[PDB]
Amino acid sequence: RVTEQMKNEADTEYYGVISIGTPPESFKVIFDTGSSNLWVSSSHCSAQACSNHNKFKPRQSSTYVETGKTVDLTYGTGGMRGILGQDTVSVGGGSDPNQELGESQTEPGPFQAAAPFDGILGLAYPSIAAAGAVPVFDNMGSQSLVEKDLFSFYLSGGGANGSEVMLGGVDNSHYTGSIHWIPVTAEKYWQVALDGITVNGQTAACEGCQAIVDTGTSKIVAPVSALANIMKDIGASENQGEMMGNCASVQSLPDITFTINGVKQPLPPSAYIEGDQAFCTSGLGSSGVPSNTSELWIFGDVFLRNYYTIYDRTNNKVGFAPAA
């Protein structure tokens, strides 16, 4: 059914548009696969964060219907406050009535103020929706709005423009080779299982690794213990607390590969290293969210810029294809 170009802030933040209300008030929301709620700065908020963002005004939408239910949604710190309501929400073109939205009441963290989006549109499963909010996608779903019950993401590199969110279709001009499928191991986050880690075609840490596939994370994150041997591998050393390493040593650095469903997919240094001039930082960090099984990897933006990503809700599976 359609796609749209969305924006890239320094390869950290991938955010784009949506419209809410009759007549429509337009907002920049982070497209987040690692969360399921929908919320927007609202005129019920007066924190400082809320002051510099685009606020949603319920009185100026002739389609709004309020619900007094409040939400307390700490997002794995984000940790705001909200009130539930209902209005028509449009994403990528002309679609969703009686869509349950969170209007913020108090929004702090030494990121809501300077974050570049006015709210968050969660794309994970209903299970992780704080306070039972119906995720957007689940509704397009139920209301049989899309051709196919898929969405996919292309992310650009070096902050170029060209990132895309495709809903109900895949964009064929964005990947090369074959789509590599793996099923969702848990219908929480978009979780998948990893059969093995390899560094230069050789083993190194997994037989039970799970990986959340998150657009909300700017990094690739590894299990707390194993972070270290990987560090020891490329030669990274603590610097403002970044793990940096000499540029000059970079074309000869290891290839990391994950065995997911029998296929071992590579991740070159070119991809996990950000060379932001004369300085090479290691974009890899320690896994922060708690495993409700056994330690987890988070495949944030560093994997997603290497792999075009397909999320499949009728068959519960995620697919990767090399990004073009």
UniProtKB/Swiss-Prot annotation:
Keyword Nucleotide-binding: no
Record keywords, A-Z: Aspartyl protease, Digestion, Disulfide bond, Hydrolase, Protease
Sequence ranges of Polar residues compositional bias: 96-107
Region described as Disordered: 86-109
SUPFAM superfamilies membership: Acid proteases
One Pfam family, short name: Asp
Segments forming domain Peptidase A1: 14-321
Active site: 32, 214
E.C. number: 3.4.23.-
SS bond list: 45-50, 206-209, 247-280
Gene Ontology MF terms: aspartic-type endopeptidase activity
An annotated GO BP: digestion
Keyword Hydrolase tagged: yes
Family designation: Belongs to the peptidase A1 family.
Name under which the protein is recorded: Pepsin-2B
Species: Gadus morhua (Atlantic cod)
Lineage: Eukaryota, Metazoa, Chordata, Craniata, Vertebrata
